[PDB]
Amino acid sequence: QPQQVVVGVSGNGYVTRQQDGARITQRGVTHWTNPKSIVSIYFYLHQPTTADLSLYAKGHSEIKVSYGKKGFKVNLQSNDFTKVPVGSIDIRQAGYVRIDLQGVSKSGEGFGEIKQLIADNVTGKSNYVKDFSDYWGRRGPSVHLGYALPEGDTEWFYNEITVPKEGETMHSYYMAAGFGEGYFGMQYNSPTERRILFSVWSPFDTQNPKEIPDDQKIKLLRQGKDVHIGEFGNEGSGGQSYLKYPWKAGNTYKFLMQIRPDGNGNTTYTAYFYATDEKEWKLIASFLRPKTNTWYKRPHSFLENFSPEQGYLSREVFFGNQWARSKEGKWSRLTDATFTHDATASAQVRLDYQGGNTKDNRFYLKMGGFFNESVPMGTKFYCKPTGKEPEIDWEALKQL
Ligand SMILES: [Cl-]
Structure with missing residues (x-):
């Protein structure tokens, strides 16, 4: 009826x-x-x-x-x-x-x-x-891609990100190169500000970084030129770093993320961004996470809208040429991406969540904007193992 x-x-x-x-x-x-x-x-x-x-x-x-x-x-x-x-x-x-x-x-x-x-x-x-929360409801459903690593121990993850003009939307986080303990990506924050962000959570669970015991605080090891370092709270807590950088829609940027245990019960996280417009690698930061002994885990990307006012607009991003480098120094091209969506999508209060294959052998994420085709939780997508193996001057990166 x-x-x-x-x-x-x-x-x-x-x-x-x-x-x-x-x-x-x-x-x-x-x-x-x-x-x-x-x-x-x-x-x-x-x-x-x-x-x-x-x-x-x-x-x-x-x-x-x-x-x-x-x-x-x-x-x-x-x-x-x-x-x-x-x-x-x-x-x-x-x-x-x-x-x-x-x-x-x-x-x-x-x-x-x-x-x-x-x-x-x-x-x-x-x-x-x-x-359901009007705030979270209007922000809309964040989407995620997780990339499968080869067997063994990965030290570096490399991913190429392109935000097409149609997908460029103010107050979006285009998270390129995440890992088990934090995030590395780029945001469009205002008409005069865009940031490359790199955040690492402390192992200590708290909403106030000042309540983290000294021996569990994220420690700064290296700071790139013009990079701002601080601490964050209220979503768990830890260390964050950003570089104001005027990235452009349609350009392909590269994110290179290094995760290396020190053998002394800590792990170091070192984030490098290829500023395509200047044709040079930038150091964002290197952070040490205590009480942690891990190689690279859970390379992933996500697409998020921060602003409830922007929920009616879609945003979209393409991820290409994913590579992993083993601790032994071997590069492998990654081919398997798993799509997931957040709890707002799971609640079925917003159906505008999508990801998959582009026609040029990349993966994409898309959300917001009240489009009509969604993609199920856990859907696996694949690409051809083509693309140029990264050529990285490791010594030069160490001098940044
Ligand atoms: Cl009135």
């Missing part, structure tokens, strides 16, 4: 144009002052169906509600929330449904406050953010 689908704006709506002219909060749409602003609400339907749309809203205004080219003009004239009819739409196929809101006239300060989109008489199952 058809059912009512109540879609909360706080977990499913975004200001998608003129960001300063409306806001999504725990209340839904508030501070909606600019007629140029567009608010978009997304929910997924499993089968074709009609839907009678209403808004749970209040205000003194005229707004425009749209589903593709079909638009409805809607007056709000109330001080308190009421269920305001919009009109019927026909969803002709499964997938994400995007409903847009735009201000047309405001009798006072703003276009009104919108708490929910209500879709009545809907046939079939739906997915969207409900009974």
